[PDB]
DNA sequence: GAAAATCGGTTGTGGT
DNA sequence: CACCACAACCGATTTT
């Protein structure tokens, strides 16, 4: 239900997931573009707690990169 | 209700934006190819990778299908229901 | 349910 | 441009 209000609802996953093999500068700038969208997003908080509650292994969710979440949950 | 046609339609549709490998794996796993699910090992053989790499690719794909960017099938026995319930399960 | 170990493609540098 | 050669790097993949 909270998904309906996400700012990324139409443009698909190009922006939030890394294609196979992406490294270096392309990888970090994709992450930045995504985060810049999330910061403006009216449901960031529900997006973030969802990703951490269920532990979404991939993508940018709620303004957090994959490895940010991996760092916030471990232990 | 024969809305099962248009659910296929829009599911073919969302699969079409995963990568080739991500789509092939979901297709082999649920048997949206010949109506016969394949084990994680059979899929490893097809892709020349271990079963564990298949499970990582599957997981990424589930992440992508449940992301808000493109998960417009939360409108509710059969493989396509198997895949649906496997996304929101 | 993973996490750690190792492999290998990429990137950047510098050559002919 | 090409090719090569590596080294470092770090995502992909294999092994616990
Ligand atoms: S937070 Fe980011 S990912 Fe989550 S809905 Fe908003 S824009 Fe989409
Ligand atoms: C070298 As292979 C593609 O069988 O992992």
Author numbering:
A (entry chain A): 16 to 90
B (entry chain B): 450 to 525, 534 to 546
Please share text taken word for word from the publication where this structure appeared.
Mycobacterium tuberculosis (Mtb) WhiB3 is an iron–sulfur cluster-containing transcription factor belonging to a subclass of the WhiB-Like (Wbl) family that is widely distributed in the phylum Actinobacteria. WhiB3 plays a crucial role in the survival and pathogenesis of Mtb. It binds to the conserved region 4 of the principal sigma factor (σA4) in the RNA polymerase holoenzyme to regulate gene expression like other known Wbl proteins in Mtb. Here we determined crystal structures of the WhiB3:σA4 complex without and with DNA at 1.5 Å and 2.45 Å, respectively, to elucidate how WhiB3 interacts with DNA to regulate gene expression. These structures reveal that the WhiB3:σA4 complex shares a molecular interface similar to other structurally characterized Wbl proteins and also possesses a subclass-specific Arg-rich DNA-binding motif.
We then cocrystallized the WhiB3:σA4-βtip complex with PwhiB7 that was used in the crystallographic study of the WhiB7:σA4-βtip:PwhiB7 complex, which enabled us to collect high-quality diffraction data from a WhiB3:σA4-βtip:PwhiB7 crystal and refined the crystal structure at 2.45-Å resolution with the final Rfree/Rwork value of 0.211/0.243 (see Experimental procedures). A structural comparison shows that although both WhiB3 and σA4 in the WhiB3:σA4-βtip:PwhiB7 structure are involved in DNA binding like the case of WhiB7, they are dramatically different in how the Wbl-bound σA4 interacts with PwhiB7. σA4 of the WhiB3:σA4 complex orients about 180° relative to the WhiB7-bound σA4 along with the PwhiB7 DNA and inserts into the major groove upstream of the AT-rich WhiB7 binding site instead of the expected −35 element. Therefore, the observation that σA4 in the WhiB3:σA4-βtip:PwhiB7 complex binds to a physiologically irrelevant site of PwhiB7 opposite to the direction of transcription initiation indicates that PwhiB7 is unlikely a target of WhiB3. However, the crystal structure of the WhiB3:σA4-βtip:PwhiB7 complex provides valuable insights into the general features of how WhiB3 interacts with DNA, which is the primary focus of our structural analysis below. Although a “RGR” sequence is also present in the Arg-rich motif (“RGRAR”) of Mtb WhiB3, the RGR sequence is not conserved in the WhiB3 subclass and only R38 in the motif inserts vertically into the minor groove of the junction between the WhiB7 binding site and the −35 element. R38 forms polar contacts with the nucleotides of 2 GC pairs, in contrast to the preference of AT-rich DNA by the WhiB7 AT-hook. The other conserved residue in the Arg-rich motif, R42, is near the edge of the DNA duplex (∼4 Å away) and thus may form hydrophilic interactions with the phosphate backbone in solution. The central minor-groove width (∼3.5 Å) around the AT-rich region of PwhiB7 in WhiB3:σA4-βtip:PwhiB7 is characteristic of A-track DNAs and is significantly narrower than that of WhiB7:σA4-βtip:PwhiB7 (∼7 Å) where WhiB7-bound to the minor groove of the AT-rich region.
